[PDB]
Design an enzyme around this catalytic site. Structure first.
Site, mmCIF file in Angstrom:
data_model
loop_
_atom_site.group_PDB
_atom_site.id
_atom_site.type_symbol
_atom_site.label_atom_id
_atom_site.label_comp_id
_atom_site.label_asym_id
_atom_site.label_seq_id
_atom_site.Cartn_x
_atom_site.Cartn_y
_atom_site.Cartn_z
ATOM 1 N N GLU A 47 12.771 105.952 6.516
ATOM 2 C CA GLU A 47 14.163 106.764 6.273
ATOM 3 C C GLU A 47 13.797 108.206 5.529
ATOM 4 O O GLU A 47 14.794 109.114 5.550
ATOM 5 C CB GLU A 47 14.859 105.822 5.180
ATOM 6 C CG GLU A 47 15.579 104.589 5.725
ATOM 7 C CD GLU A 47 16.768 104.767 6.675
ATOM 8 O OE1 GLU A 47 17.061 105.922 7.113
ATOM 9 O OE2 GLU A 47 17.716 104.106 6.497
ATOM 10 N N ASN B 202 25.100 111.563 9.077
ATOM 11 C CA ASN B 202 25.352 110.734 10.050
ATOM 12 C C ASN B 202 26.764 111.197 10.468
ATOM 13 O O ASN B 202 27.854 111.395 9.873
ATOM 14 C CB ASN B 202 25.342 109.262 9.277
ATOM 15 C CG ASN B 202 23.921 108.906 9.308
ATOM 16 O OD1 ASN B 202 22.956 109.354 10.034
ATOM 17 N ND2 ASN B 202 23.769 107.874 8.291
ATOM 18 N N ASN C 142 24.539 107.120 2.292
ATOM 19 C CA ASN C 142 25.871 107.557 2.704
ATOM 20 C C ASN C 142 26.663 107.847 1.629
ATOM 21 O O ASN C 142 26.738 107.178 0.360
ATOM 22 C CB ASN C 142 26.344 106.648 3.783
ATOM 23 C CG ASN C 142 26.949 105.505 2.973
ATOM 24 O OD1 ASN C 142 26.452 105.036 2.040
ATOM 25 N ND2 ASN C 142 28.034 104.969 3.623
ATOM 26 N N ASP D 174 29.183 109.747 11.041
ATOM 27 C CA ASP D 174 30.341 108.756 10.127
ATOM 28 C C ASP D 174 31.020 109.815 9.465
ATOM 29 O O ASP D 174 32.147 109.409 8.899
ATOM 30 C CB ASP D 174 29.773 107.735 9.640
ATOM 31 C CG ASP D 174 28.852 107.972 8.676
ATOM 32 O OD1 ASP D 174 28.014 108.782 8.561
ATOM 33 O OD2 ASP D 174 28.511 107.106 7.893
ATOM 34 N N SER E 293 29.426 111.200 6.985
ATOM 35 C CA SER E 293 28.877 110.950 5.762
ATOM 36 C C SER E 293 27.562 111.571 6.026
ATOM 37 O O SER E 293 27.128 111.864 7.219
ATOM 38 C CB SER E 293 28.733 109.517 5.293
ATOM 39 O OG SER E 293 27.933 108.851 6.203
ATOM 40 N N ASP F 85 23.146 111.404 4.569
ATOM 41 C CA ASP F 85 22.343 110.380 3.834
ATOM 42 C C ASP F 85 21.470 111.101 2.922
ATOM 43 O O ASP F 85 20.644 112.073 3.181
ATOM 44 C CB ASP F 85 21.332 109.740 5.197
ATOM 45 C CG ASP F 85 22.216 108.743 5.758
ATOM 46 O OD1 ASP F 85 23.249 108.128 5.399
ATOM 47 O OD2 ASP F 85 21.889 108.474 6.877
#
Length: 129
Positions: free
Chosen positions: A35, A46, A59, A48, A50, A52
């Protein structure tokens, strides 16, 4: 702050997650390599909408406050960026709980299929306890 192998493995136990809430020493170490690449400075957004944040790829949408993600519960209620400093001392607060959620470690995309069932005893090997 960029970490070494045995540089990231002790301070996990220093904060009390050993076999925490039924989650042992074998289930942690593999994930941050996947990660954050043992990095504390890996910020990625991401699709979305959002991003990270931190070494955990958090998020802003569900747990933190980044100000560019509306409709976010901002449930942790702290700077979505403090989650970035070498001092993680406060970050896991939201780590020990997001699991009480009951849907498990299954909150991350990689360890789930990238790290689960894998030889984990091996990540805790070659080091001292």
């Amino acid at each position: 702050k960029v970490f070494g192998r045995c540089e990231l493995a002790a301070a996990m136990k220093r904060h009390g997650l050993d076999n925490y809430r039924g989650y042992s020493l074998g289930n942690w170490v593999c994930a941050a390599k996947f990660e954050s690449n043992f990095n504390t400075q890996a910020t990625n957004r991401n699709t979305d909408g959002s991003t990270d944040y931190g070494i955990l790829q958090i998020n802003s949408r569900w747990w933190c406050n980044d100000g560019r993600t509306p409709g976010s519960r901002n449930l942790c209620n702290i700077p979505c960026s403090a989650l970035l400093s070498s001092d993680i001392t406060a970050s896991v607060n939201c780590a020990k709980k997001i699991v009480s959620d009951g849907n498990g470690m299954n909150a991350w995309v990689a360890w789930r299929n990238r790290c689960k069932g894998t030889d984990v005893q091996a990540w805790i090997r070659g080091c001292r306890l």
